[PDB]
Design a protein around this nucleic acid. Sequence first.
DNA 1: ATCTTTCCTATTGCTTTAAAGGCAGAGGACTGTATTGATCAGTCCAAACTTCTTTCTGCATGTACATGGAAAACTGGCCAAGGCAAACACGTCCGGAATGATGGTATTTAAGAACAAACATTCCCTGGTATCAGCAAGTACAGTGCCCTGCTGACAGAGCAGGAGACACAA
DNA 2: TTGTGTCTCCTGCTCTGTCAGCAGGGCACTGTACTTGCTGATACCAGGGAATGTTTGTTCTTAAATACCATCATTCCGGACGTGTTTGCCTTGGCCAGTTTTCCATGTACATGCAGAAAGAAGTTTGGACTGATCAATACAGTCCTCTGCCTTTAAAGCAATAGGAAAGAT
Lengths: 97, 97, 95, 95, 102, 102, 83, 83, 109, 121
Amino acid sequence: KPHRYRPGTVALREIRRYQKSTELLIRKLPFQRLVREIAQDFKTDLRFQSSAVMALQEACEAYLVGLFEDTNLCAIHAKRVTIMPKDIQLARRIRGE
Amino acid sequence: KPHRYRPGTVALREIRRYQKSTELLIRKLPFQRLVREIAQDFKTDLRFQSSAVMALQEACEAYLVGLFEDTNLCAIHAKRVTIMPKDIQLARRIRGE
Amino acid sequence: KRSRKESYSIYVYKVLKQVHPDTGISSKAMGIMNSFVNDIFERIAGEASRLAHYNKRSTITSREIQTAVRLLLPGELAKHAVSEGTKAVTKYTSA
Amino acid sequence: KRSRKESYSIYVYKVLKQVHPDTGISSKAMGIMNSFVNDIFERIAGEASRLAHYNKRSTITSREIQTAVRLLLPGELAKHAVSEGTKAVTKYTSA
Amino acid sequence: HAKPPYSYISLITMAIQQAPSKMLTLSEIYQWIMDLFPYYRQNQQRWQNSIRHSLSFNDCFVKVARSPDKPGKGSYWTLHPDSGNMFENGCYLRRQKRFKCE
Amino acid sequence: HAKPPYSYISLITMAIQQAPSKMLTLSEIYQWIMDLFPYYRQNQQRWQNSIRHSLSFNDCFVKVARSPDKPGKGSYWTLHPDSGNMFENGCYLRRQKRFKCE
Amino acid sequence: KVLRDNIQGITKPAIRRLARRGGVKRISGLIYEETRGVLKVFLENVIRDAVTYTEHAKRKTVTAMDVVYALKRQGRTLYGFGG
Amino acid sequence: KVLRDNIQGITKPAIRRLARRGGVKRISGLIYEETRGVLKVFLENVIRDAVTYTEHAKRKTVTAMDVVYALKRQGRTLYGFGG
Amino acid sequence: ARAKAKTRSSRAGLQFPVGRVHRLLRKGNYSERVGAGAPVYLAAVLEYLTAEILELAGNAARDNKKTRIIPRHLQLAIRNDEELNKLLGRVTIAQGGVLPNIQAVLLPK
Amino acid sequence: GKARAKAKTRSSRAGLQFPVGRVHRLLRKGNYSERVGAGAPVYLAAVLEYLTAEILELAGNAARDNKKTRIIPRHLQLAIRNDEELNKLLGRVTIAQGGVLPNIQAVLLPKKTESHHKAKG
DNA sequence: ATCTTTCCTATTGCTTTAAAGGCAGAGGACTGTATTGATCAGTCCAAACTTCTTTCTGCATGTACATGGAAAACTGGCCAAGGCAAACACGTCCGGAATGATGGTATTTAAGAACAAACATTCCCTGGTATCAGCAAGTACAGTGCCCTGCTGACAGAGCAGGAGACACAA
DNA sequence: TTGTGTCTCCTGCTCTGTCAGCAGGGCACTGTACTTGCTGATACCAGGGAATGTTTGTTCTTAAATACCATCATTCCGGACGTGTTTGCCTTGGCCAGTTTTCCATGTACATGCAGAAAGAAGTTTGGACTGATCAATACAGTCCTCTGCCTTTAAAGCAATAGGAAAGAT
């Protein structure tokens, strides 16, 4: 029968890869579109430098990585390996966000 | 038969009492002695204003109250009503200390 | 007498009388309000100085103060403060 | 003409050669180092300014810089940095 | 061939005694039994599991591990010294007063 | 326009060969390349650095200093006499066994 | 020209990768909506300050320096962009 | 003169009251030591900066403003004493 | 002859001190120069925020049957208002205590 | 008068590599104080040079661990986060094109079971 | 479900001390005039942003099988809630002092202001070696079929002692 | 000649040999993926020449800062005493942890579709540079009145005691 990795192996390998690497994880153009859409409310017909969008993507990715680390810690504290919205809510509340 | 409140009622009563109140909860003299004991390590014969000691006590009490609130939230996250040292450790780790 | 130590007590008291003529305020509350005013003043001034440095300008005008107010105050509190500041500057400009 | 673009790349490079003559540094790494230097400079300068304002000092001396370094840098970094600064100031004063 | 007139206990005892080192693994025991008894060449699983049960049950057989990893994959089995000549001289099919450690 | 059917090595070799002194600076090389190939008008910061990489990596191009101070900035570049026929006989894109000094 | 539904641009695999870099082994289905909401809130908070900085300069182009100042204004100091 | 073991001065009832003010209903036995350690670390961290500020002014008395500056530097601004 | 001098606060119709704010701005080393409208704007904003906080604190005090504002009332006003709480999220109020809050799960059956 | 003595940079006089004059100009232009001391730029430049030396040394060590020779943002991030004091100094700082320290909680690691057969519920 | 016990909450009097009000004064804020250089206003470059098009994948979505992690349920025991009694150590005042933070004046030395010289720092060419991308091998570990080592309950059938028949001793 | 002990053969409980079958622990073999080597490409680190503007040198000057001395304020320390709080003990009950069971939703694998990325180009907006100018801020002098400090006053809130009502616990 064909090979099939047990659950957990692929997840851990992905964890190791993405912790060892440093490349961005969010696609660039949709992120730019989202940034422009959010900017439309504050002001119309704005212009953006590419470096500004790259910095925004970097900051957002770092913030999300930190949030996911906190969520994983909270989930493990509850004797669970599966993060849930309650974990994120608790992490944000503890961090005052 | 002698009257005895079941467990938890007195805890809720005390919580209500001390959430409604505002006075300091730590005894002033031993806390001052502790501050002096910590202070002397950096320099001997240090003088201290009473207002400085009161401000330190206020800051410490506020920090501990926030830490205990976060600890209680974490304990409730694990479906527990009793705080444990792991709860405080998790709260400190998430807070970034 | 000792060296003069200035505080914003009288101004906050006048504002309290305006909003609530009947009520009073405690000395510790007065000090807390003074600390709050000092903190807000320091925040706004620092933000204005940072904005001026970013713009490479030497002077801080009402525009910088408005920018700092919008950056600091959240939500509805910011716009009402902006309107109040605009009204005050408009009144002062007429001399 | 285009505005001049001053930076600390050459000095950071000289320090790198002093500690590691063989290794190099990338352009983005150079920019990150410049950003770090700017951040530390701003932090130390602001701390010294606040200290002087508390003490009503009109000038920032080496003592204020030492105080700022002690306050900001944690643990051994503060001690070694203070020693290096004192050595540099003594050497400067001797000549 | 019919079943040899020998108990599995007797077979294990003979296999252990005839071994140069006085100790054999399960695979070696099976190989010796099959070589010396053509009857056991068939129905392998049944009598092999029976041998497994006998080794795990009878105190007269005691296992010895292999320390420096040897060929590995299987621990040696040795006769308990106190057993003595229990199946000797015409009592292969049924021993008398089986050996008990305690 | 697409890229010409000539590598940077071939372009630089032709530019040096057509020079009256058989030597050119990077500015003259850029001028010649831009004049003779409209494709290189754009992406200047890219293809100029590519020509730099060619002239600098390839040992077949060897530099010459300016003796009487000339215009100054920019030392000359010359084809190595030991290079020989490298891009000749229809191998403009790639040079088999790229020239090495050491 | 008008953009309406870019929030879905944050794909499920992208959130999976972000969680993986955070060491998450198992992810619940409801995480993705919450992740999108939190990301949108953070983006709005940053971009509001960035737009304020750009407007105060009287410019119509948002520069990376404005982003750095906004992030630093929120305590998220960032390097590698001329800050 | 010298002080030896005042960390024990933070009595168990005081810690229980502090937890109760935070809404804690049930308390484990091991909390008291951990709370004492955390409080000691926080006090040391604050007092180091306070003594540094006191030293810079060449004063031998730690004033309230020094404590306010130390707390403010740690992002824990406190009102009611900055005067 | 010199006419009757008028406070810049009176000219702007504000209670807060325009002159003191301008002097603090000049003496604070914030910038080499200070505009005329900047202190007026800053004083107006400060007065507005102070008025809002005082109004909320007075409402809280009236809820508590008191007549003089105290740090408890200030904390109640600040934390009950989302905008002010966000503005003063990191701030600690001496003698302010905390709001009454008990989690639902802790309540008895 | 007196004939101008040949100039020597204050950086050279103090022995530092960083620019004393540029630091002094930045301090004066930054409106940090009404005046700037003469030794303050020297002290600040020395401290900055020491910090740069420490960070560069750690980054070069990390690069050597990675068999590389040119420092990249990954090396800087590894050096900053691995060191406790530097990490505390730069806890809230973010580095462009950085990463994270390799770290997986022990619970998330696979359960080492002596008996390991085909997966079943 | 109704009675007992406890606690919280509220009401009323006294007081006390904390906040409101009056008066002096001073130093910093208002008025007036001149300098200025920091800012505002207009025009142009170009470069950098925005917009549009074609291809190629790498990515995202969709679907299906399934296992183990989330959830629930029950037991128990031991951890901690609740209450009583005793001891002491926190808390309060009363005073001594002594330590040191802050005010007043001199002076000195340190740095701000101005201008000349210059050379260190910046911008534009230049060689060459360290880093990124694609294809291909060795190394590493996951997963699992299979086997060895334990235990448990029960059935099937040879062993050897017990009892009955045959034979020889004893009376 | 007749009854019974002893030897021998059949019978029957004992005990061992055999079977089926579930649990832990461990090994070898296949398979999949990660890392490294080779090659190619490239981009940026360092030497060489020209430029400009920022730093050093020198002098004057004036005021910020240091030093010395004086003054009182406010914090440390001790003594005595009140009694509220903490420590220790005891009881016991219910909440955390262990164990078991259920089941469904996340993981993994593969198939299909599609739009993000990148090259290339065109269109276009305005950020910044430069010159003219002009006006709002700074500088300086006079003066006058707004805010701080002291002293007096009175009432809002804290302390003490009592009483009413809410609610927990229990049969």
